[PDB]
Amino acid sequence: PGCEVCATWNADQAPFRLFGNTYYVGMKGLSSVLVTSPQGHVLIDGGLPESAPKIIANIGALGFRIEDVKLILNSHGHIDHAGGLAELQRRSNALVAASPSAALDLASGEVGPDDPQYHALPKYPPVKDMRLARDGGQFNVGPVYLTAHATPGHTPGGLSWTWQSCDGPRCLNMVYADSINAVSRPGFKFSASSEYPNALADLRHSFETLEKLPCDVLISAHPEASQLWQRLEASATGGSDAFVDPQACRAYVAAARTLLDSRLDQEKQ
Ligand SMILES: [Zn+2]
Ligand SMILES: [Zn+2]
Ligand SMILES: [Zn+2]
C-alpha cells in the first residue's frame, strides 16, 4: 500500500553543512534545516510524520542533539512540512513558530477550506504549543536571529525565513524559501476560488517579496526546486562555494512565475 510520491520525498539523505552554522538535516524530497549555536539550535520544518525520526537521526549524525533544539520554524501547513512537527516538539520541548494561517492547520492536523489541497491530504499529528510568526517577525535563540517573511500563494499561510551565517569574518545571507508553486487538488482554481480569493494577489506579492531578498544561500522547502542535489554534488570538490549563488531567489521566482503562467492558461481554457 505504498505511496510512491511520499516514499520518494522521504528517502534518506545524509546530512551536511551548508555554510557556517547552517546544516541540512532533511530528506531527498523534503527540506529540514538546522541552525546551531552554543545556546541551542533552530530547526526549520519537520517533513512528513515519518520524516521526524530521520531528521532526528540526521541531527545526531552531525554531532548535535534534538534536545538542544530550542525553536522550531514552519514554512507552511501541508503534511509534508508539518507532519513531523509534533514528534520534533515532543523530543525537543521546543516551541513551534508558524503563520497565523498555518498555525490553524498545525493545531488541528489538517488544512482548512481555503487550502488548494483541502480534502486531498491526510490528517497529521496536531502541534500542541505554538507561537505566531507574522511578516517581519524576528525570532532568536541566543545569537542566531531569524526573520519571517509572509509568502503565501501555494497556501494562504506560507512563510519564508532569513538569517545570516558566518564562517569567521565572512557573513552570508541565508534564505529558506517556502513553496510558491501553483499546484492543487484537481478542480481547484487559483484564478477563481471562493474560499481562497486572494490566491493570485498572494502569489504575485510573494514573487515580489522573494525576488528582492538578500540571497546568498538558498534552501527551498522542496530541495530540488533550488537544485540542492546538483549543488551538493558540486560541493564534493568545490566546497561551500557550490551552495553560494546570489541570483538563486530571483531564479526561484522566475521559475514559479513560469509555472503560474502555464497554470492560469490551463484554468482559462
Ligand atoms: Zn503520499
Ligand atoms: Zn505544500
Ligand atoms: Zn511540500
Ligand SMILES: [Zn+2]
Ligand atoms: Zn472535495
